[PDB]
Curated annotation (Swiss-Prot), chain A:
Renumbered residue ranges of the record's region 2 X 15-17 AA approximate repeats: 157-206
Subunit structure, interactors included: Component of the large ribosomal subunit (LSU). Mature yeast ribosomes consist of a small (40S) and a large (60S) subunit. The 40S small subunit contains 1 molecule of ribosomal RNA (18S rRNA) and 33 different proteins (encoded by 57 genes). The large 60S subunit contains 3 rRNA molecules (25S, 5.8S and 5S rRNA) and 46 different proteins (encoded by 81 genes).
One GO term describing the cellular component: cytosol
Gene: RPL10
Function: Component of the ribosome, a large ribonucleoprotein complex responsible for the synthesis of proteins in the cell. The small ribosomal subunit (SSU) binds messenger RNAs (mRNAs) and translates the encoded message by selecting cognate aminoacyl-transfer RNA (tRNA) molecules. The large subunit (LSU) contains the ribosomal catalytic site termed the peptidyl transferase center (PTC), which catalyzes the formation of peptide bonds, thereby polymerizing the amino acids delivered by tRNAs into a polypeptide chain.
UniProt cross-link Glycyl lysine isopeptide (Lys-Gly) (interchain with G-Cter in ubiquitin), position: 39, 100
Alphabetical list of InterPro entries matching this protein: Ribosomal_uL16, Ribosomal_uL16_CS_euk_arc, Ribosomal_uL16_dom, Ribosomal_uL16_euk_arch, Ribosomal_uL16_sf
Stored Pfam families: Ribosomal_L16
Name this polypeptide is given: Large ribosomal subunit protein uL16
Family: Belongs to the universal ribosomal protein uL16 family.
GO aspect biological process, one term: translation
Lineage: Eukaryota, Fungi, Dikarya, Ascomycota, Saccharomycotina
MF GO annotations: structural constituent of ribosome
Post-translational modification Phosphoserine, affected residues: 133, 195
Subcellular location as annotated: Cytoplasm
UniProtKB/Swiss-Prot annotation, chain B:
Annotated InterPro entries: Ribosomal_eL29
BP GO annotations: cytoplasmic translation
Keyword Ribonucleoprotein: yes
Pfam families: Ribosomal_L29e (PF01779)
GO molecular function, one term: structural constituent of ribosome
Protein's recorded name: Large ribosomal subunit protein eL29
Function: Component of the ribosome, a large ribonucleoprotein complex responsible for the synthesis of proteins in the cell. The small ribosomal subunit (SSU) binds messenger RNAs (mRNAs) and translates the encoded message by selecting cognate aminoacyl-transfer RNA (tRNA) molecules. The large subunit (LSU) contains the ribosomal catalytic site termed the peptidyl transferase center (PTC), which catalyzes the formation of peptide bonds, thereby polymerizing the amino acids delivered by tRNAs into a polypeptide chain.
Region (Disordered): 1-36
PANTHER family assigned to the protein according to its UniProt record, in alphabetical order: 60S RIBOSOMAL PROTEIN L29
Encoding gene, per UniProt annotation: RPL29
Biased segments, Basic residues type: 1-25
Transmembrane segments: none
Cross-link annotation Glycyl lysine isopeptide (Lys-Gly) (interchain with G-Cter in ubiquitin), location: 51
Organism encoding this protein: Saccharomyces cerevisiae (strain ATCC 204508 / S288c) (Baker's yeast)
UniProtKB/Swiss-Prot annotation, chain C:
Source species: Saccharomyces cerevisiae (strain ATCC 204508 / S288c)
Name assigned to this protein: Large ribosomal subunit protein eL21A
Family: Belongs to the eukaryotic ribosomal protein eL21 family.
Cross-link annotation Glycyl lysine isopeptide (Lys-Gly) (interchain with G-Cter in ubiquitin), location: 31
Gene: RPL21A
MF (Gene Ontology): structural constituent of ribosome
InterPro entries, A to Z: Ribosomal_eL21, Ribosomal_eL21_CS, Ribosomal_eL21_sf, Translation_prot_SH3-like_sf
Subunit structure: Component of the large ribosomal subunit (LSU). Mature yeast ribosomes consist of a small (40S) and a large (60S) subunit. The 40S small subunit contains 1 molecule of ribosomal RNA (18S rRNA) and 33 different proteins (encoded by 57 genes). The large 60S subunit contains 3 rRNA molecules (25S, 5.8S and 5S rRNA) and 46 different proteins (encoded by 81 genes).
Entry annotated with the keyword Cytoplasm: yes
Swiss-Prot record, chain D:
Keywords assigned by UniProt, alphabetized: Antibiotic resistance, Cycloheximide resistance, Cytoplasm, Methylation, Ribonucleoprotein, Ribosomal protein
Subcellular compartments: Cytoplasm
One MF term in the entry's GO annotations: structural constituent of ribosome
Note: Present with 13600 molecules/cell in log phase SD medium. There are 2 genes for eL42 in yeast.
Protein name (Swiss-Prot/TrEMBL): Large ribosomal subunit protein eL42A
The keyword Ribonucleoprotein belongs to this UniProt entry's keyword annotation: yes
GO cellular component entries: cytosol; cytosolic large ribosomal subunit
Segments traversing the membrane: none
Amino acid sequence: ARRPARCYRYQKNKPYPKSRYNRAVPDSKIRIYDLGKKKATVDEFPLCVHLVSNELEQLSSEALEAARICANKYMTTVSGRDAFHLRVRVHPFHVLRINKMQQGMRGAWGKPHGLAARVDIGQIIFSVRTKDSNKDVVVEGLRRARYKFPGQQKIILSKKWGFTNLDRPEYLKKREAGEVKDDGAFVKFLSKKGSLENNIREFPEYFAAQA
Amino acid sequence: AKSKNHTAHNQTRKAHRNGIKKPKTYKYPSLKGVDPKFRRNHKHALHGTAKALAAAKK
Amino acid sequence: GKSHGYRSRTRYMFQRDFRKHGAVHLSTYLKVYKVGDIVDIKANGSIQKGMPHKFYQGKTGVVYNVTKSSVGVIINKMVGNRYLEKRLNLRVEHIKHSKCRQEFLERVKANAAKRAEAKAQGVAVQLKRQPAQPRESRIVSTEGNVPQTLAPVPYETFI
Amino acid sequence: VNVPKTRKTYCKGKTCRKHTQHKVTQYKAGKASLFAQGKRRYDRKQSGFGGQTKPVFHKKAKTTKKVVLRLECVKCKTRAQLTLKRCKHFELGGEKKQKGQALQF
RNA sequence: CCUCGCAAGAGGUGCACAAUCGACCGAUCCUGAUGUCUUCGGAUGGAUUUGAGUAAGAGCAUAGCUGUUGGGACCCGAAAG
RNA sequence: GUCGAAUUUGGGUAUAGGGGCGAAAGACUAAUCGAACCAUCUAGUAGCUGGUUCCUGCCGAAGUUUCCCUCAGGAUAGCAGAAGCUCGUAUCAGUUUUAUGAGGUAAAGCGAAUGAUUAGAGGUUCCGGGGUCGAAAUGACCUUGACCUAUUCUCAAACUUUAAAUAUGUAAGAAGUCCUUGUUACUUAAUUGAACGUGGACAUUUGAAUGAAGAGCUUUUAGUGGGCCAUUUUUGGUAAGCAGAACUGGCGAUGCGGGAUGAACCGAACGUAGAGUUAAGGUGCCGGAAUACACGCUCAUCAGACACCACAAAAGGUGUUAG
RNA sequence: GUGAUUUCUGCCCAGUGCUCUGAAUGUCAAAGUGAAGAAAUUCAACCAAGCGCGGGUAAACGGCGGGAGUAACUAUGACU
RNA sequence: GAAGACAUUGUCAGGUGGGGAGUUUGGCUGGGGCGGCACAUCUGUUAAACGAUAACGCAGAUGUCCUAAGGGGGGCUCAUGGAGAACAGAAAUCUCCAGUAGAACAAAAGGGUAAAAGCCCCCUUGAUUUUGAUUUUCAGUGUGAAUACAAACCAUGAAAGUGUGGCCUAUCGAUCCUUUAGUCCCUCGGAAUUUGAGGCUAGAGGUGCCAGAAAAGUUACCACAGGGAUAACUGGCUUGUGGCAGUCAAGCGUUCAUAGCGACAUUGCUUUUUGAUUCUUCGAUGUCGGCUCUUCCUAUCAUACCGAAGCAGAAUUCGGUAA
RNA sequence: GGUUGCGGCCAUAUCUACCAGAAAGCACCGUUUCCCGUCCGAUCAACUGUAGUUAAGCUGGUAAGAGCCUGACCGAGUAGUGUAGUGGGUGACCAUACGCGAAACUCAGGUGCUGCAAUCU
Ligand SMILES: [Mg+2]
Ligand SMILES: [Mg+2]
Ligand SMILES: [Mg+2]
Ligand SMILES: [Mg+2]
Ligand SMILES: [Mg+2]
Ligand SMILES: [Mg+2]
Ligand SMILES: [Mg+2]
Ligand SMILES: [Mg+2]
Ligand SMILES: [Mg+2]
Ligand SMILES: [Mg+2]
Ligand SMILES: [Mg+2]
Ligand SMILES: [Mg+2]
Ligand SMILES: [Mg+2]
Ligand SMILES: [Mg+2]
Ligand SMILES: [Mg+2]
Ligand SMILES: [Mg+2]
Ligand SMILES: [Mg+2]
Ligand SMILES: [Mg+2]
Ligand SMILES: [Mg+2]
Ligand SMILES: [Mg+2]
Ligand SMILES: [Mg+2]
Ligand SMILES: [Mg+2]
Ligand SMILES: [Mg+2]
Ligand SMILES: [Mg+2]
Ligand SMILES: [Mg+2]
Ligand SMILES: [Mg+2]
Ligand SMILES: [Mg+2]
Ligand SMILES: [Mg+2]
Ligand SMILES: [Mg+2]
Ligand SMILES: [Mg+2]
Ligand SMILES: [Mg+2]
Ligand SMILES: [Mg+2]
Ligand SMILES: [Mg+2]
Ligand SMILES: [Mg+2]
Ligand SMILES: [Mg+2]
Ligand SMILES: [Mg+2]
Ligand SMILES: [Mg+2]
Ligand SMILES: [Mg+2]
Ligand SMILES: [Mg+2]
Ligand SMILES: [Mg+2]
Ligand SMILES: [Mg+2]
Ligand SMILES: [Mg+2]
Ligand SMILES: [Mg+2]
Ligand SMILES: [Mg+2]
Ligand SMILES: [Mg+2]
Ligand SMILES: [Mg+2]
Ligand SMILES: [Mg+2]
Ligand SMILES: [Mg+2]
Ligand SMILES: [Mg+2]
Ligand SMILES: [Mg+2]
Ligand SMILES: [Mg+2]
Ligand SMILES: [Mg+2]
Ligand SMILES: [Mg+2]
Ligand SMILES: [Mg+2]
Ligand SMILES: [Mg+2]
Ligand SMILES: [Mg+2]
Ligand SMILES: [Mg+2]
Ligand SMILES: [Mg+2]
Ligand SMILES: [Mg+2]
Ligand SMILES: [Mg+2]
Ligand SMILES: [Mg+2]
Ligand SMILES: [Mg+2]
Ligand SMILES: [Mg+2]
Ligand SMILES: [Mg+2]
Ligand SMILES: [Mg+2]
Ligand SMILES: [Mg+2]
Ligand SMILES: [Mg+2]
Ligand SMILES: [Mg+2]
Ligand SMILES: [Mg+2]
Ligand SMILES: [Mg+2]
Ligand SMILES: [Mg+2]
Ligand SMILES: [Mg+2]
Ligand SMILES: [Mg+2]
Ligand SMILES: [Mg+2]
Ligand SMILES: [Mg+2]
Ligand SMILES: [Mg+2]
Ligand SMILES: [Mg+2]
Ligand SMILES: [Mg+2]
Ligand SMILES: [Mg+2]
Ligand SMILES: [Mg+2]
Ligand SMILES: [Mg+2]
Ligand SMILES: [Mg+2]
Ligand SMILES: [Mg+2]
Ligand SMILES: [Mg+2]
Ligand SMILES: [Mg+2]
Ligand SMILES: [Mg+2]
Ligand SMILES: [Mg+2]
Ligand SMILES: [Mg+2]
Ligand SMILES: [Mg+2]
Ligand SMILES: [Mg+2]
Ligand SMILES: [Mg+2]
Ligand SMILES: [Mg+2]
Ligand SMILES: [Mg+2]
Ligand SMILES: [Mg+2]
Ligand SMILES: [Mg+2]
Ligand SMILES: [Mg+2]
Ligand SMILES: [Mg+2]
Ligand SMILES: [Zn+2]
């Protein structure tokens, strides 16, 4: 009873969120956006490869989840379930309606049907971090999730360290200096702004200008 | 038997044939809406200076 | 069905200017208005009495009358193919003096100056305003400044 | 609603022409009286044949009425009228709204 | 149109019309003098009221086109009563 | 079918139209019956259908507003014609510039409020629950939740600090500006003010641009009150040559060149003609006009061939081309 | 109204009809009566049939239930 | 002989009276009907940053409620959270701290509001009198609602002030008739007095189809004027649904992704499905099925020749050229 | 320059933490006969200026402070947008032509100005 994904492919309607005014909507077929070793430290996984959309279109949750499987499945069984962090970067917040079915076209406002993510051109769908030696495994990983989606998307080697905001040399310059300290799966950065007091408490290994 | 509900189509073409005529200025507009207390006294003020300029021709 | 009430559609229009809520500052009531002043109309949601209708929001008019708490304004509102004269009764909170004439009042007493200070000198005035003219010729030097040659850059990605 | 049985308000009675105290009561009806020209003219149209000769109203919408207070100047005798907004329950008795009380039993 | 000026201009008077403030008559409301068959009389001066009014008349009549209403009503047409 | 009877049948006679007659079918009552036939009221009414008769000249629409037992119709405003009338460099403008306002859409934002959403990290419990120690503890230790703190991925027609473009109000002088100092019953402590004035000073570089086959004004009346299409914005619908809005431009009411063909596309709007030049579109032949010039690409056992437009997708190729 | 014969035509009068030696103090027209009033008129009491109250009636019009449980497997349910 | 002032008859009055007469038996609407109310209104959004703006668009609301929940003055500060106090526990009352409003202000929503517009108290009736102007809706009609003055009479506060109902945006009603208030006024036309009646000004009794008729069915016995403005059949656009065909390859197939199959996804084709639409036809294009006969399509069931096989043979399955 | 009374603008004035403040002022502060108000002279009212104090308020300074304000060819001529074509693409979309042009970000600078009257080493 799922209408072919051809029917909702394009972005024809204003965003229709689940809201106080919507309320009846089903649940997203894709509920988990972080797979593999997502506790991993920022230094562990320098190599970042994105799945990037070349279209302005809509991705169903059922196609999202189905691709998330295919990609995370290929990666674990070849490089191992700890070798990568797959981050689904796109959340299906927008509700597709359907006019189910006696009168025909009178009063035709539909009821929630599925969910989709509204996707830009150049907008990232999947993001993966590993170490450079794992590249060709990652890439074939996303390349098969490609087949799960409508519309052209292209894989892209990031100029960035993992999921950080910095290019690999600029992360190195900052990290071999004091400015970077670990967190969570992410990092924090020493700011030259604010109270000097606990700016030094945190980041003790700065304030040398040496190793 | 449904039919077109409404449109403003063609309506500014019609408006522009003969019109959008500018507001029509006048020296000496009306006192319409003006405060009675003001206007009652003003009635006398003018009658005063009118009586003045009469005794200015004598 | 449809809903057309007096304040309909005015959600953000009568809203208060972020972190500007509360009392109206006291200058608003010290300002003094006379018949003939041009005023701008901006309704203040905090004062519900004497409020202009939303159509006159952002509209300039001429005060025709002055009362205890209020000034009457006349506005030319155009209905159909003509204009009609609407007169509005507004609390002073909704009305500010218009700057629309100040460049004219500046320019009159300025054009009066360079008129006297010229004629008493023997004429040569030119006090009408002229538009932006095309600029004249000029000679740009190369001294300390040699052209820096630029070319189109190639395609990169960086994401 | 609930309104008082007394009202201090403007009396126009020309010997007072000032604020006095009014006894407040609810206006009612008044009797038919044939010989009102309307009933007299209607009674004639109705004799003979032809059936009902005038419309007879059916499609009733309002579930309420507008209450009309009869104000009475206790001094100068002249009575005035005032008409309240539409209301479903009207007592001009008493038992005012009361303070902070606690619901009973 | 009149006066001045060679002319440009300036002043004088300004019908029709238009804008504006007033005055007059009736209505409404207020005021209520002199007097009186002590209840008649209603001067006088007023008022965000009001009239299809006054303020040196513009009509009446015949005729024409166009338009209006009633009429068989531009022509032919019900089922019925 | 029935054929000796509730049989067939002639003639005479009775019953008449909201009436008759009916072994009952709304049957029959003179080819007429869910109310016969004849004349008259009667040219009944018809918001409905059809038609409405000579030529040329000029101007030239509407399918929209409001009200209607209104939705196939009227009234009302609008658009249209006509008649003009008072004036005239005058005043006028579907335009720009300058000055000064108004706005919360687009984008943007979420380590800003509200609301949603992925992930961890670090804290806080006499206190949500579980478990070991236990007589217990306002006990200690794991623990999982909730919260708090600094971070992190992602969103909003009915969220938002900020915030456009286009569109929009007002102003750009003689109805202006300055001086002197009158009137009043309003107003002031007050000849204070407010309003309206008398008298005086400065002309067209008199106060931005461009245009102006002038501007202003009055009366009366037609048709219309089914609209439809295209680019852009845009709602409902999987969609529709589908339904509904916004601004403009069209078609309708309109031929002409082009798109073979075609209401709406492109070009361009029509008095009768001559010469020239073009538009959109074309120039192998049909067919007016280079089987022109130039560099590449393409070989298809269903090649391809020009907008609107008369469809094709994912996904593939050790065909060939260039990266 | 039902439709030869044969056989049998059960329960229901609350409803709508029909109908009655019924009840009585409910309601109820014109006239007539009484009261007030200058009179027009107003108010009152009385009051026919009828309605209401009551009784009869289905070969009058017509109607003729729903939920649980329950018997030495299950099932079923005479029974509740 | 019978009957007898009773019957009868006449005039009014009540009952009864589809036996008969006359009439009526809303609108919008993706045909009409059922339904809903988009029929009079309010908030937010759709609405494209002035204004306007449509659908049986989206989320809601209105026919009320209040002598205070109206008016004025004074005082006070709210939601929550933290830390404390006998019974007392998650929740009782008491205290301090923090607290931009996270509360409350009848109700829908959106504005608005902090020595308030919220909470407690004190005093009250301006929710009053007169008659104009103005804003929204608009025709610049009416109604509703609202604004700012004028003229009273009042409230409250030391006062400035404020107050013409409810913080703002909804909460409602012609002509005729009846009824009441008002001045004590005009008229009853031969003249008075008194009842009665009629006028004038202002309210109430209501029209919700909300610019405002007094209104049940049935027709298959049916009628007329029309409509392709409008349904049922062909055909047209659409292709959700139906049907057929791919791509990725997790799985199935003893082992083995693809011999034969194939999930999660996803791209398509088709017009013997059914829907959606309402363009053509309502001054008529003869419905279902069968019989008969022709011709065409191919997504091939058989027959011809082939390639695969989890093809030993036999049988079968998948595929190709094939109508 | 300080302070006070009344202010205008209404965070460059607010917030958090500390330090400093002479003279005057303000304040805290003392009393409850009186007018007045409270459960409570805490608030409020009156009386004292006597008997005390800079502790608080108040003023100012400090902080790679939070916030807020201002600026910049920081981002970015980016996003978006008015106009154009028989422009590209099956489409979704996109490029170009003549114009207009943000927000975040990044960086630097800043932390009340000021009117009237009185008063003060
Ligand atoms: Mg619905
Ligand atoms: Mg793909
Ligand atoms: Mg219709
Ligand atoms: Mg249509
Ligand atoms: Mg129409
Ligand atoms: Mg609405
Ligand atoms: Mg409207
Ligand atoms: Mg109010
Ligand atoms: Mg009477
Ligand atoms: Mg009477
Ligand atoms: Mg009286
Ligand atoms: Mg009232
Ligand atoms: Mg006939
Ligand atoms: Mg008839
Ligand atoms: Mg007959
Ligand atoms: Mg007859
Ligand atoms: Mg007869
Ligand atoms: Mg015949
Ligand atoms: Mg016959
Ligand atoms: Mg005829
Ligand atoms: Mg005829
Ligand atoms: Mg009609
Ligand atoms: Mg022409
Ligand atoms: Mg009507
Ligand atoms: Mg027609
Ligand atoms: Mg908006
Ligand atoms: Mg928004
Ligand atoms: Mg947006
Ligand atoms: Mg932003
Ligand atoms: Mg947020
Ligand atoms: Mg939250
Ligand atoms: Mg625990
Ligand atoms: Mg402009
Ligand atoms: Mg010119
Ligand atoms: Mg000319
Ligand atoms: Mg007309
Ligand atoms: Mg018309
Ligand atoms: Mg119409
Ligand atoms: Mg066009
Ligand atoms: Mg036509
Ligand atoms: Mg045309
Ligand atoms: Mg044309
Ligand atoms: Mg073609
Ligand atoms: Mg053509
Ligand atoms: Mg073009
Ligand atoms: Mg040929
Ligand atoms: Mg040739
Ligand atoms: Mg091409
Ligand atoms: Mg193309
Ligand atoms: Mg290739
Ligand atoms: Mg029989
Ligand atoms: Mg018998
Ligand atoms: Mg029986
Ligand atoms: Mg029994
Ligand atoms: Mg019975
Ligand atoms: Mg009976
Ligand atoms: Mg009687
Ligand atoms: Mg029964
Ligand atoms: Mg007798
Ligand atoms: Mg009958
Ligand atoms: Mg009948
Ligand atoms: Mg209908
Ligand atoms: Mg219905
Ligand atoms: Mg209403
Ligand atoms: Mg809008
Ligand atoms: Mg708007
Ligand atoms: Mg609906
Ligand atoms: Mg608490
Ligand atoms: Mg309307
Ligand atoms: Mg209303
Ligand atoms: Mg209140
Ligand atoms: Mg009376
Ligand atoms: Mg007489
Ligand atoms: Mg009398
Ligand atoms: Mg009398
Ligand atoms: Mg009535
Ligand atoms: Mg109606
Ligand atoms: Mg209506
Ligand atoms: Mg009938
Ligand atoms: Mg029959
Ligand atoms: Mg049709
Ligand atoms: Mg399909
Ligand atoms: Mg399908
Ligand atoms: Mg195998
Ligand atoms: Mg296996
Ligand atoms: Mg396997
Ligand atoms: Mg037909
Ligand atoms: Mg035909
Ligand atoms: Mg035929
Ligand atoms: Mg045929
Ligand atoms: Mg094998
Ligand atoms: Mg000291
Ligand atoms: Mg200190
Ligand atoms: Mg202080
Ligand atoms: Mg700072
Ligand atoms: Mg294009
Ligand atoms: Mg672009
Ligand atoms: Zn009195």
